[PDB]
Design a protein around this ligand. Structure first.
Ligand SMILES: CCCCCCCCCCCCCCCC(=O)OC[C@H](COP(=O)(O)O)OC(=O)CCCCCCCCCCCCCCC
Ligand SMILES: CCCCCCCCCCCCCCCC(=O)OC[C@H](COP(=O)(O)O)OC(=O)CCCCCCCCCCCCCCC
Ligand SMILES: CCCCCCCCCCCCCCCC(=O)OC[C@H](COP(=O)(O)O)OC(=O)CCCCCCCCCCCCCCC
Lengths: 148, 257, 258, 148, 149, 148, 148, 150
């Protein structure tokens, strides 16, 4: 009969919908609400807690997702490769890519400033300057010992 | 008599290690023997309606109930930790990482691990199967192969639907009566779930004791004796399939925490 | 016919409540009707062997497996936070107030929730259950009353044994497989369970299912139509309804006491 | 009256369809939350922790949920779109917005502050002035490394 | 007519099952032998950031009742918190000041009532006239701790 | 037969022994952990985080638990009733109990600092001297608005 | 067919007894003579976050365990005992033993500073001079409530 | 003779369950090609309070490896930590110091590595001679609270 096939098709579609929901509406992946995105390199003198799948942001709004971290085997710096949503590409090249601790003890994500009005971007280029990752040590190893 | 009891225990120990062998040979003949003249996809659809679509009204409500249980419980055990916002990162972990995939085994092997062996044992008792070899159709690849394929591809979907309904129930009860901030709830949940280590882990964890639940639910009915034989084979398959859900749960979660 | 389809749906819906009323009438007649001549305690002992003792291997191996799963899972989840030295508190909290009675319901309703139904069903369908009425022995107070009384007082004990073995087998993997301080395990365990709020709570949550699992596992066997297929359908109706009842009544009994 | 007892099928469907509607009734509103909500917009300089559906608050009590976040491609600031309860409509225009923090660790929620002027609002208008959200970097980078 | 009796008992027991609604079914939240009824009281605050309903209202630390309503007035734009106090305590003077304290360092923010002093106790169904707000992190930091340096 | 009757008996006794093991070797129940000891009252000004069954202590080592919290309607203060370990019967009356947070963010317990006096204890008398529990609001509200 | 029937039966029984013997060996795995850990006492004025089976350490690495805590009836101060691995047996008596907090919030442990150089230890002796564990109140109660 | 084949394939299936899949034992991770070949490094500290095993060792924040073990150097009576580094990063000079850092504000203490200044790089089996110790809330507050405030 045909009610059999309609029922089993509805059940299969419900199972596939549940799988895709658990994937996207719970975790999120390359597939999802976001479309195409372009990569961007950045050089930080330290990335303390920066792990993959952070929230690279501007002014708070999410700009994309960090992709890879590396210790550049030449300068011993943190090379961070991140993804930027194509919904926003107008950001300038000559900006500052800072790390920020979310709230007070949230995930250490990446924010970026606006770099004036120069040549916009190549979306695959690198960044020039960045504020290194703050930690308890670089602070309480100078301002509690070699200070008042 | 002690010696006769030891003889019987050794006989049973040889039987269970030989049954697994006979069951494996039966699974082999069932899945990739040949192409029987009467098979097709209509059989797979029919047995997918009996195994999966009839087992929807049980595991969906089970997902709802275990979801509100998981939320209403963790929030109580977390009200004293201060992180009553992590409830999202719980009813989407326990109900995804271990309990949600497992309970779908403990339950699918109760509704379609028992109904399957009853429907495929009463067939053997009413001479159905023996009357299929005389028509020339291989009973394994016509009667039991669609059961196997309807258990392989309908328990993972059952687990996914169970986890979705459980997560949504934990949400509904975490926000309505528990008053937890819906925003922070879904936020922490979406953040700390780590797809590649939890969602796909639960899915493979479900496929394992899908393959192993439908295997011993179908076999235990293809190898039973009479109404008393089937009424015992259904209990045997419920027990063996709950055991092989929990044991495979331990073995799998040991290989991937 | 769509109108007759809705007729059949309403028929099944009213049949469900009619069967529920017949079932509570049957339970009433079974538990407190009258002392029949054949009745005795040896009945209860035989059934306690057929319902509980045979269901010990399944429930104990389940306890061990689900306990080491609970531990080996929480240890991963607690590793990121750093309170792994409290894993013993976790398993003794989940496997004793929520996952203990729930899983031993889903499991006691699987073995002795299906064995019972199939057994007294095959009784009804071989006239063994009717031939007792000719001899005068009421079957309720002889065939089902010991089943009910061996389900009421063997599922709570099964849940206690299950939780004990699960706690111990969670220790046996947190301690001698993942390496936490055994003394810390047991100590942090016995400071944050509050017996009168979790242990007795789990015991009551298990008793309520023990009553509601062995009641719909022996009724569904005293009510199946007398054939070889009605019985194979009742031993599935009872597993479904008993897992559903375990889950639902556990939801209630945990909303009644967080 | 058994042929009349097809009506119990409808007693069940109308009791199940009602359950379905209640399953889609997840909004937290009977007369309290919004009733019939209404739009408004705000432009912040940094919206670090105001992920969507966060509670908006006047004098602390919730008013609505922030419906969406936006990076205005013009100036790369944060245009948030938030919904406001029906009954609360006396919010003056000079009521400025600011991003408070939930307790001391909880994710940031935005609130408004009545300034007081005649022209109330338009529910489709926007808020001009605001105080941005704090960040544990500027607070120590521009006010701890700055004078100490 | 056995179906009549069966359906009757089935409904009489399905009622007793739905007699377990268990969603704010016991409006009193302690037991069946405790005090019982409670007095009502309101307070007008300037900021109630963390006074989520079903919290705790207390005096000197010991819990006195729970917050029921978190309403907002349209005229003055000040939050109106409507809480209840257990029957045993009914002797709090009108001049008592309600202030929102933060449990521990991060715990749920509760509303304490510091007793002032007067003869006239209360109407216990009336409002409070004085208060002290709930110190929020942002406004505090930006105003004062930024002002020092 | 008695061949199986012991089996039922054996495993029923095993179930009951498991119940007892859950009630004793997991909860320290009324089998004997601390003997039948006498209470003592203490009057405080604020008992905010003093839940039931706290850890009343001396010099850090545990002494017992608080049994009850009360609002004595006369002076509107905190009447805390706590049990003291009976063998410890050398706590003078001039000793003072203060509410302390366990370490940095632990549950608010009370600790008894020994004053030292000839007369020791009735074990049912009240205490007089105390240091009420701190509260973030009053603390930062009277030492940040005035001092700096 | 029978010469190996009971043979494999006894093989399985031997396997099962080996499994049961492996299960039993948890409680008291191989403690024996407590390895080479021997008692040593310590006195403190206040040990808040020091519960039974706490951690002891030197230079961060774990030295042993914290055996038991108690209240001396005479001086009304806290005595604590700890077990020390004999692999370290160069700890002189002038070594101090203070209380530290794991990380910044983790349960309080006992750290031991090696101190000077003298007669080492008898592993059963009693450490003499030390510093107690800070309590939140007295700090803000005498450094904030009194100075700033 | 069919029962013989049945029990034989049964033993075979039990072997396929136990040997290949169970026993949760020695890692064959990339044991043929494309491996990491972690190498040991020693470091002496003064307090390693939160450097329990299986922690993280990193340079500039990107994880370089994990900590193998910790111990007490009996003669020195100071902490000794042995941690591994991937053979891909073999460019860390000798005078590169180690330092116990705290992730965020409460995240577990990891071991960061500040680069050195010499040309001699490393042996990956050698030690680290100079470093900075960890902090401790008690000794820290014990230093600059009653000495520079009162
Ligand atoms: C089979 C059953 C498997 C269930 C075990 C799954 C463990 C996953 C833990 C979920 C929560 C993780 C989290 O955010 O946990 C984090 C929390 C607190 O962290 P935050 O305050 O930073 O959010 O850590 C805890 O102290 C509690 C851990 C979770 C408690 C859940 C215990 C298991 C649930 C069983 C129900 C009873
Ligand atoms: C990523 C890896 C992929 C996973 C691969 C899946 C593995 C499949 C193995 C399943 C084995 C079942 C075979 C079929 C059984 C059958 O039909 O055979 C059924 C026969 C019944 O014989 P009888 O007629 O005598 O009753 O025997 C059984 O009942 C078998 C019971 C099933 C138990 C399986 C549990 C396996 C795990 C055990 C845990 C180990 C303990 C260690 C803890 C310390
Ligand atoms: C957010 C809202 C959602 C929450 C919904 C609440 C659900 C509550 C749980 C539902 C119960 C599931 C039972 C399923 C059985 C069924 O369907 O019933 C189905 C069968 C009839 O089906 P048939 O058509 O096969 O005959 O009925 C029975 O078997 C009768 C026995 C059922 C017993 C019901 C439970 C009784 C409760 C007793 C509690 C008091 C115990 C205290 C004693 C010490």
């Amino acid at each position: 009969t045909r009610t059999l096939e309609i029922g089993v098709g509805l059940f299969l579609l419900a199972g596939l919908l549940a799988l895709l929901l658990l994937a996207l509406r719970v975790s999120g992946l390359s597939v999802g609400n976001a479309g195409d995105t372009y990569k961007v390199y950045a050089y930080f003198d330290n990335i303390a807690g920066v792990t993959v799948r952070g929230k690279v942001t501007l002014a708070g709004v999410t700009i994309g997702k960090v992709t890879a971290v590396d210790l550049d085997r030449d300068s011993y710096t943190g090379r961070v490769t991140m993804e930027i949503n194509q919904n926003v590409n107008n950001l300038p090249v000559d900006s500052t890519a800072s790390i920020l601790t979310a709230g007070l003890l949230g995930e250490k994500y990446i924010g970026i400033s606006v770099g004036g009005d120069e040549d916009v971007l190549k979306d695959g280029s690198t960044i020039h300057d960045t504020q290194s990752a703050l930690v308890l040590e670089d602070l309480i190893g100078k301002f509690l010992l070699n200070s008042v | 008599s002690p010696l006769e009891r030891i003889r019987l225990f050794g006989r049973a120990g040889l039987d269970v290690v030989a049954a697994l062998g006979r069951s494996t040979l039966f699974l082999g003949h069932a899945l990739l023997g040949r192409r029987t003249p009467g098979t097709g996809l209509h059989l797979l659809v029919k047995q997918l309606y009996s195994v999966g679509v009839l087992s929807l009204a049980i595991i969906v409500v089970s997902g709802l109930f275990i979801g509100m249980v998981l939320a209403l419980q963790g929030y109580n055990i977390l009200i004293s930790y201060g992180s009553e916002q992590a409830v999202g990162q719980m009813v989407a972990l326990t109900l995804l990482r271990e309990l949600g995939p497992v309970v779908t085994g403990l339950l699918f092997a109760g509704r379609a691990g028992s109904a399957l062996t009853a429907e495929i044992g009463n067939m053997k008792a009413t001479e159905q199967l023996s009357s299929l070899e005389m028509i020339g159709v291989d009973p394994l690849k016509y009667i039991v192969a669609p059961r196997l394929w309807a258990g392989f591809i309908s328990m993972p979907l059952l687990a996914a639907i169970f986890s979705v309904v459980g997560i949504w129930g934990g949400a509904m009860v975490a926000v309505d009566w528990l008053g937890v901030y819906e925003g922070s709830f879904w936020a922490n949940m979406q953040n700390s779930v780590q797809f590649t280590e939890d969602v796909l882990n639960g899915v493979i964890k479900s496929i394992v004791f899908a393959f192993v639940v439908t295997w011993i639910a179908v076999y235990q009915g293809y190898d039973c004796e009479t109404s008393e034989g089937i009424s015992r084979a259904t209990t045997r398959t419920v027990v063996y399939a709950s055991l092989a859900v929990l044991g495979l749960d331990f073995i799998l979660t040991a290989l991937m925490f």
